[PDB]
Amino acid sequence: VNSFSGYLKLTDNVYIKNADIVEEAKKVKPTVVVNAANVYLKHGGGVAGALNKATNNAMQVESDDYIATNGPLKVGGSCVLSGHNLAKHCLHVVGPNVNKGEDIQLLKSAYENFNQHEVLLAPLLSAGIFGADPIHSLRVCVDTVRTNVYLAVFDKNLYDKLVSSFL
Numbered sequence: 234v235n236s237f238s239g240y241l242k243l244t245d246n247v248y249i250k251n252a253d254i255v256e257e258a259k260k261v262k263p264t265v266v267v268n269a270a271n272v273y274l275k276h277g278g279g280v281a282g283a284l285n286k287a288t289n290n291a292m293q294v295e296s297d298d299y300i301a302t303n304g305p306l307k308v309g310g311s312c313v314l315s316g317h318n319l320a321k322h323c324l325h326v327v328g329p330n331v332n333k334g335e336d337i338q339l340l341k342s343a344y345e346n347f348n349q350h351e352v353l354l355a356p357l358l359s360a361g362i363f364g365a366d367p368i369h370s371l372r373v374c375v376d377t378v379r380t381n382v383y384l385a386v387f388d389k390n391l392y393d394k395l396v397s398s399f400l
């Protein structure tokens with residue numbers, strides 16, 4: 234039993250809700266919140282900009298030190314950093330950005346990072362400003378993630394389409 238509330242159950246391990254991931258994280262304080270990161274951990278917009286804003290830019294400060302030490306992530310890769318005031322940990326995961334021409338096949342590799350954590354609060358990878366089809370992202374999530382994932386979908390209209398079209 235965990236404290237996530239109001240989710241629709243899609244499969245044995247995947248749950249979904251129309252919610253603002255920032256507000257969900259502030260309420261639940263999950264062990265892991267997933268950020269929709271880019272390889273430079275520049276948290277300018279989309280989910281990343283919103284999460285970073287909620288940390289009063291502490292996420293960006295920590296991320297800049299991470300990059301200065303380690304260099305950029307790989308597309309499809311991840312790193313674990315602090316969750317600041319939102320969660321114990323933040324798993325920064327880089328899905329492919331279609332608006333940069335990146336290979337959508339890398340979306341499966343991106344979701345594989347979730348399997349290193351027993352329970353996660355997450356957005357749909359590569360959705361939103363990353364330009365992928367969210368219906369496809371949900372399909373890849375369900376077919377790749379085996380650990381318990383709670384998906385927050387900001388847009389109510391999109392949430393309804395994801396549920397109604399879910400096979």
Ligand SMILES: Cc1c(C)n(Cc2ccccc2)c2ncnc(N)c12
Pocket residue numbers: 252253254255278279280283356360361362367385386387388391
């Ligand atoms: C700011 C923000 C963004 C861009 N997205 C991704 C997204 C948005 C619209 C359609 C699809 C995906 C979020 N997802 C969850 N919570 C959030 N606060 C956000």
Ligand SMILES: [Cl-]
Pocket residue numbers: 269278279280281360361362363
């Ligand atoms: Cl985004």
